[PDB]
Design an enzyme around this catalytic site. Structure first.
Site, short mmCIF file in Angstrom:
data_model
loop_
_atom_site.label_atom_id
_atom_site.label_comp_id
_atom_site.label_asym_id
_atom_site.label_seq_id
_atom_site.Cartn_x
_atom_site.Cartn_y
_atom_site.Cartn_z
N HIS A 85 0.83 -1.20 0.00
CA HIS A 85 0.00 0.00 0.00
C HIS A 85 0.87 1.25 0.00
CE1 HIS A 85 0.63 1.55 4.14
NE2 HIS A 85 0.95 0.29 4.37
N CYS A 86 0.29 2.35 -0.46
CA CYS A 86 0.79 3.68 -0.12
C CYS A 86 -0.32 4.38 0.65
CB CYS A 86 1.27 4.44 -1.37
SG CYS A 86 0.32 4.28 -2.86
N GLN A 87 -0.59 5.64 0.33
CA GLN A 87 -1.72 6.32 0.97
C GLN A 87 -3.04 5.84 0.37
OE1 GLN A 87 0.44 10.33 0.54
NE2 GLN A 87 -0.53 10.63 2.56
#
Length: 149
Positions: free
Chosen positions: A89-91
């Site tokens: 994931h990122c944001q």
């Protein structure tokens, strides 16, 4: 927000909220997490439920993500060889993390970059890698096709 996306049975592309959802992760037999930001927490870290890897990228148009491909893929493969899933994931799950996933598919399922992009885009229509990440994916495709890492 978009749902967490299964890419493969052991590889899920998601957002910062997905990275906080202990129930889902344990349901999906996820044992590994890749957090592709420099600044978000490793959610649930002190619980010692997961093996974490930070790829401390900024979302800047100068960011080098190719740098992290080898190490990202090794961690996914470590998860896979031992029967666990991995959450990356990122944001939002739209650019930095989606680029790593596309790159892993080009490498470990020998998809062309277009095909890998369409594969992820079909499952996670949200994705939109930044243009400099799209540029790095094309250069990784040349490199994959000649034998240059």
């Amino acid at each position: 927000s978009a749902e967490l996306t299964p890419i493969l049975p052991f590889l899920f592309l998601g957002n910062e909220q997905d990275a906080q959802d202990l129930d889902t992760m344990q349901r999906l037999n996820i044992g590994y997490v890749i957090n592709v930001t420099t600044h978000l927490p490793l959610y649930h870290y002190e619980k010692g439920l997961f093996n974490y890897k930070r790829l401390p990228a900024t979302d800047s148009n100068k960011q080098n993500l190719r740098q992290y491909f080898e190490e990202a893929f090794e961690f996914i493969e470590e998860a896979h060889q031992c029967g666990k899933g991995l959450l990356i994931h990122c944001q939002a799950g739209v650019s930095r993390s989606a680029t790593i996933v596309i790159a892993y598919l080009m490498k470990h399922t020998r998809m062309t970059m277009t095909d890998a992009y369409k594969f992820v885009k079909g499952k996670r229509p949200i994705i939109s890698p930044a243009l400099n990440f799209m540029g790095q994916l094309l250069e990784f495709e040349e490199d994959l096709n000649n034998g240059v890492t």
